[PDB]
Amino acid sequence: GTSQWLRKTVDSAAVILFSKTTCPYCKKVKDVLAEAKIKHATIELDQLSNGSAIQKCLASFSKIETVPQMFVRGKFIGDSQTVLKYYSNDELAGIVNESKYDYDLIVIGGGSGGLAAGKEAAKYGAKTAVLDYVEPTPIGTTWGLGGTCVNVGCIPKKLMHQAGLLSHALEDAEHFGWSLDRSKISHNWSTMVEGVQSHIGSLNWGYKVALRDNQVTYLNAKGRLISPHEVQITDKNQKVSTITGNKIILATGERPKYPEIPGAVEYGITSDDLFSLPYFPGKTLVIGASYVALECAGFLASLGGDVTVMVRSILLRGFDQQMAEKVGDYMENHGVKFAKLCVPDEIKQLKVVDTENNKPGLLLVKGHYTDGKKFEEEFETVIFAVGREPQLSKVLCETVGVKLDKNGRVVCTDDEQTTVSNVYAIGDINAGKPQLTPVAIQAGRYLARRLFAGATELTDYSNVATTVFTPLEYGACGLSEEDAIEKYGDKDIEVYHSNFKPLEWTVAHREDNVCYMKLVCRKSDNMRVLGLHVLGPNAGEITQGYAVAIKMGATKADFDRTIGIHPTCSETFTTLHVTKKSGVSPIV
Amino acid sequence: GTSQWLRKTVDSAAVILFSKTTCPYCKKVKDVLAEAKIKHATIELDQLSNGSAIQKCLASFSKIETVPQMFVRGKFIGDSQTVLKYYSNDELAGIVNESKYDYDLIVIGGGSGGLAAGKEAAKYGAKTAVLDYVEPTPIGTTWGLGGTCVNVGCIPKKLMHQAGLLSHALEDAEHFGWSLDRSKISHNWSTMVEGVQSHIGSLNWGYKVALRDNQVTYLNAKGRLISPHEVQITDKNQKVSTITGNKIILATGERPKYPEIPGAVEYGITSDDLFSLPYFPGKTLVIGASYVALECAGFLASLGGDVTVMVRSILLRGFDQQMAEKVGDYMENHGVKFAKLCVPDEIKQLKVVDTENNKPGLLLVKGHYTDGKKFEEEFETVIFAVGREPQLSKVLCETVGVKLDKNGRVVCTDDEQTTVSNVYAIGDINAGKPQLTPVAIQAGRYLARRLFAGATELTDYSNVATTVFTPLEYGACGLSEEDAIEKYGDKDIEVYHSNFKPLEWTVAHREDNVCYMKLVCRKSDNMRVLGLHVLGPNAGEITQGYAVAIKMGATKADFDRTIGIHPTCSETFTTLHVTKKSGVSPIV
Numbered sequence A, B: 001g002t003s004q005w006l007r008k009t010v011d012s013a014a015v016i017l018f019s020k021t022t023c024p025y026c027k028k029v030k031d032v033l034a035e036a037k038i039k040h041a042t043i044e045l046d047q048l049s050n051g052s053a054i055q056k057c058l059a060s061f062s063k064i065e066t067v068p069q070m071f072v073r074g075k076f077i078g079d080s081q082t083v084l085k086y087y088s089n090d091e092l093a094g095i096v097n098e099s100k101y102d103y104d105l106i107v108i109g110g111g112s113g114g115l116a117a118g119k120e121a122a123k124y125g126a127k128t129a130v131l132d133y134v135e136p137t138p139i140g141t142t143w144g145l146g147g148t149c150v151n152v153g154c155i156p157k158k159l160m161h162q163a164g165l166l167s168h169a170l171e172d173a174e175h176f177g178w179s180l181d182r183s184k185i186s187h188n189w190s191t192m193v194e195g196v197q198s199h200i201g202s203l204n205w206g207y208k209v210a211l212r213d214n215q216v217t218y219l220n221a222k223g224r225l226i227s228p229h230e231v232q233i234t235d236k237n238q239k240v241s242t243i244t245g246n247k248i249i250l251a252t253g254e255r256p257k258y259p260e261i262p263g264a265v266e267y268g269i270t271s272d273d274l275f276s277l278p279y280f281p282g283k284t285l286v287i288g289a290s291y292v293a294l295e296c297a298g299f300l301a302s303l304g305g306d307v308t309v310m311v312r313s314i315l316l317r318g319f320d321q322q323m324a325e326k327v328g329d330y331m332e333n334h335g336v337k338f339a340k341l342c343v344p345d346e347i348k349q350l351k352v353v354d355t356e357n358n359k360p361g362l363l364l365v366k367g368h369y370t371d372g373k374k375f376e377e378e379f380e381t382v383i384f385a386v387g388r389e390p391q392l393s394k395v396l397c398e399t400v401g402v403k404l405d406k407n408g409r410v411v412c413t414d415d416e417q418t419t420v421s422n423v424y425a426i427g428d429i430n431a432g433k434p435q436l437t438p439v440a441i442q443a444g445r446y447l448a449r450r451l452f453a454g455a456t457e458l459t460d461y462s463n464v465a466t467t468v469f470t471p472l473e474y475g476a477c478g479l480s481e482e483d484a485i486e487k488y489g490d491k492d493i494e495v496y497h498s499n500f501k502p503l504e505w506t507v508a509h510r511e512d513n514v515c516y517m518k519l520v521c522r523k524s525d526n527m528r529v530l531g532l533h534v535l536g537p538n539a540g541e542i543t544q545g546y547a548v549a550i551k552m553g554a555t556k557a558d559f560d561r562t563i564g565i566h567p568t569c570s571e572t573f574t575t576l577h578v579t580k581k582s583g584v585s586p587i588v
């Protein structure tokens, strides 16, 4: 262990200091490096069990066994006496800047993962470049630094979801004794959009400042890996140039798919366009049944929209199907219409989008049902949410040797390594991994720590918790019921479940037995919780704490002996007793 | 183990059936008992490891080792052939009803704990009586069945807290693009109260129906334990009578304290009166600094009230004091005034409460500061929240021998047993235990299971999570920072912390760095999480899931390797890095 770890650490770290907490010579270097503003990784050997073994192994790299020992890019440079001697002639700055490449790290893609990796790498003194370019949508929509998450993903989505939730809050308020007014109140799409885009703008700038303050070179350019250490860039003026980097992190993310039909690219929009849309969508058709499709359709209906969802087969493919049905049922009972077992054939333009009046055009949607029957209806806006795809053919030359799977995603090892050794991939482009922001963040941060700070900790991709932000939120963590049954057998699976109602909904006169939760369990493994599922308000806030417990290997008994907090929705998980095999109704 | 467990189980259970899942003779009895509607405990011996040992020990009680064996109140009555033989002559009903006392269980107090115990006991066929009486407040306020929680506690408190939160939702809504109107909106106390009391009414009736359906005798009477097995009752007509019970559960709860000063009892109200108060309190003084005091003052200010809190010394004594200060700071920045280091001397009436006009009176509050300076100000309503006390001198004769501590609470063992063997105490009256609803529920349910179903599981009272429902909610689970430091030493405690802001507050233009969370950890125990603390929206929904993890023995590393759900407030617990000893600002 010790031998292998040290070689890899020395060869990969840009600037690293092997040290002990109780040393005046180590402190003299630390104070010098802080004064010269030279960022570095610090390994306190007296804080490690194999610290004494490492010192003897350090002799193979430096000839000495004492501390401190400073290394720059796989090379020993000197001890405390020598480092302070270099600092005396003002030569140390040039030594730590000496490199074979332009950068220790090039990050292609300035999104969640890419920014997390870049910022973390810079902490330990790696010269880092972050490349970001936003290719315009068919209709020319572009945005700033931050990736999908900040600009056209989680952030604007949840803000518009909140705007939708306040519709219900306005209704509830009367029952709770507030004078209004709810029928005489309307929503303004433009007021909301500008507020949301104003917050997006501050994050765009926030990241630009963060990279600057962490001394990370930000380039607004399109990157292309032409060789393992060479990245071709293209700036705003179409200048083509080549930069070199020791390690390459690919974090280019995904973009929405378009079905191969006439009219789609011309007359339809995606989530990329919706969040900055100058006009209110109006009568809207959402083609697709992903979480994006349902979330978007969800708030649009809550913002006084005539919304139809066109579903090819099932809702939320990949998610628990019982839970998916309940998500849809709520939406259908609160305005959202569904065109079941339906696919589109073409979109004909009936009216052109009025730019100078902030109004949508008009589109004729032609499609067909599974049986063969025809679909024909007029919509003001058609939103495609039919999936998301990586576009690595634009990013990656075939000659480089980075292997991609059937879906065009980068095949990685458990430490994010591509088939090219110095090249890594994180985020949505990493095959088989949950496609979520914090996954990209943990991946990026941890990778940067392993590369430049000698860390060993890998990212755990199992039991990653999710929340679908539909009108009624759906939070999950672990396996679906059908997956657990398939993996272990029906006789080994016990499902505890209960309907419930938020206390806030009682006075507000909202429907009983709409909120549902369940625990999927393995009987032969001391009733181990394999999956947690909650449909209700703040389902994300509910699920999070439990994801830690499931990680630790929570059983049903661990839930039972914990005491609930009253009055909350979440406390219901602490007292579940009704099983599915008993057949007793989950109602309260 | 086996020997001792079986004797206790047989002697305590009212109706119990020792059985095996794979037996046609056992099924014949089960179908007979279900048909005759005779409720019973079932012990499946083939589902237990020491099941074979129990069968041999059952011979000492029944002479036989086969199953099924039916026991009634410490006595063997017959096997499958004999039980069906009794059912044939229609004699079985009389055998299972044969008792030395009127009831197998008498529960004194129809609140959270008492109703949980009673309902659970009835499941396993124990003849159960639940006694509840609500002594009128000085001003004559009374309520129905359900205890403090339902009528004058958690339920009406959180509903009025929600009504207060909607004030903020009405403000936020404009920023999120809704047309209003927020300055032209007012709140109506009477509309809210009647809605809240209407929900309280349905719970009052819900419990009456539940006890009936579970065949539990509900008596609206004041109980008094005069001997270990004798309970004296007093009904609505002042009829005095005596009922006998095998086991006695004391669940009489607490009532608010009054300071020993002139005017307090006459002209002041408590939380007992506030939740059904016909008039709006108006300019209000809250005397006290408990969670009740701050919660009440909190929503009253949010409902257009002029609110002052009179504090003797510190806020939320017993809670984390850093967290308590932040709770107060928010309140002070959102309308709530504080009279620091102040105590009351007397309340003089300036104006009598106008009953026929739904308006408060007027009171002169005279008090003094710690230095000696005088306090004098006019208030429309004075609310006392100076603590809560048990009133067991009214409930319990000194001759019975039930030991009480210095604060008048029942001293119990770890299985809720009083100094009298057949007498038990649960809920708020159980000394040293967290005074919360779900604690009373778990205690009651589990006790009933041990008494009448042969269960062994005790209630765990450690690391019970709390949430103070102030304008900004405060959720905690575990030790405070000062307690952890005291118990283990400053050098062994590491505190990770971070300020944060809800995504919903960005567009709504609310203050940055108001929401705060921390993890108190023990360095020498692999950075074990000793205490979790969160100040923010839905702090109860946030904390709950974590309480399970802490129960399992969560470390900081367990939080770190779990992946966050984005965008949520709770996810911030998964990425904490700033320690208090580093001195770096917790701001984002």
Ligand SMILES: Cc1cc2nc3c(=O)[nH]c(=O)nc-3n(C[C@H](O)[C@H](O)[C@H](O)COP(=O)(O)OP(=O)(O)OC[C@H]3O[C@@H](n4cnc5c(N)ncnc54)[C@H](O)[C@@H]3O)c2cc1C
Pocket (backbone or CB within 6 Å): A108, A109, A110, A111, A112, A113, A114, A131, A132, A133, A134, A135, A146, A147, A148, A149, A152, A153, A154, A157, A221, A222, A223, A224, A251, A252, A253, A254, A271, A292, A394, A395, A426, A427, A428, A429, A435, A436, A437, A438, A440, A467, A469, B565, B566, B567
């Ligand atoms: C509508 C919607 C809602 C979502 N909601 C949630 C949610 O609630 N919770 C959650 O966890 N996740 C959510 N996500 C998913 C989440 O946004 C992604 O998983 C996350 O963005 C992954 O980050 P990434 O760095 O891998 O990709 P991105 O954040 O998309 O970053 C990739 C960046 O690289 C850029 N790039 C591409 N090619 C090049 C090139 N060759 N040169 C330079 N730059 C390039 C792209 O323009 C992009 O900015 C949502 C996504 C969508 C679309």
Ligand SMILES: Cc1cc2nc3c(=O)[nH]c(=O)nc-3n(C[C@H](O)[C@H](O)[C@H](O)COP(=O)(O)OP(=O)(O)OC[C@H]3O[C@@H](n4cnc5c(N)ncnc54)[C@H](O)[C@@H]3O)c2cc1C
Pocket (backbone or CB within 6 Å): A565, A566, A567, B108, B109, B110, B111, B112, B113, B114, B131, B132, B133, B134, B135, B146, B147, B148, B149, B152, B153, B154, B157, B221, B222, B223, B224, B251, B252, B253, B254, B271, B292, B394, B395, B426, B427, B428, B429, B435, B436, B437, B438, B440, B467, B469
């Ligand atoms: C303002 C307020 C807010 C609260 N908020 C929360 C919260 O948010 N979360 C939480 O967990 N807890 C909260 N609580 C505390 C919680 O209500 C109690 O811990 C809970 O009620 C304990 O239940 P209990 O059965 O022990 O007592 P109770 O629920 O009070 O039941 C005792 C019952 O016995 C009756 N009784 C008394 N003497 C006799 C007699 N001799 N004969 C017959 N009956 C008798 C009483 O009238 C009462 O109805 C709050 C309390 C208050 C006052």
Ligand SMILES: N[C@H](CCC(=O)N[C@@H](CS)C(=O)NCC(=O)O)C(=O)O
Pocket (backbone or CB within 6 Å): A022, A023, A024, A025, A065, A066, A067, A068, A079, A080, A081, A082
């Ligand atoms: N080696 C000298 C001085 C540093 C030194 O004396 N090394 C000590 C640090 S206190 C050391 O590592 N001692 C040997 C050990 O720890 O095993 C230098 O750097 O110029």
Ligand SMILES: N[C@H](CCC(=O)N[C@@H](CS)C(=O)NCC(=O)O)C(=O)O
Pocket (backbone or CB within 6 Å): B022, B023, B024, B025, B065, B066, B067, B068, B079, B080, B081, B082
């Ligand atoms: N004992 C008879 C019939 C029941 C019987 O044969 N007992 C079986 C139940 S299948 C038994 O407990 N077998 C012995 C054992 O399990 O060890 C009766 O109840 O009238």
Ligand SMILES: [Au+]
Pocket (backbone or CB within 6 Å): A148, A149, A150, A153, A154, A155, A437, B566
């Ligand atoms: Au995001």
Ligand SMILES: [Au+]
Pocket (backbone or CB within 6 Å): A288, A290, A292, A293, A385, A386, A387, A388
């Ligand atoms: Au999609």
Ligand SMILES: [Au+]
Pocket (backbone or CB within 6 Å): A500, A501, A502, A515, A536, A537, A569
């Ligand atoms: Au709920």
Ligand SMILES: [Au+]
Pocket (backbone or CB within 6 Å): A566, B148, B149, B150, B153, B154, B155, B437
């Ligand atoms: Au309660």
Ligand SMILES: [Au+]
Pocket (backbone or CB within 6 Å): B288, B290, B292, B293, B385, B386, B387, B388
């Ligand atoms: Au109190």
Ligand SMILES: [Au+]
Pocket (backbone or CB within 6 Å): B500, B501, B502, B515, B536, B537, B569
């Ligand atoms: Au927050």
Ligand SMILES: [K+]
Pocket (backbone or CB within 6 Å): A288, A289, A312, A386, A387
């Ligand atoms: K599809």
Ligand SMILES: [K+]
Pocket (backbone or CB within 6 Å): B288, B289, B312, B386, B387
């Ligand atoms: K006090």
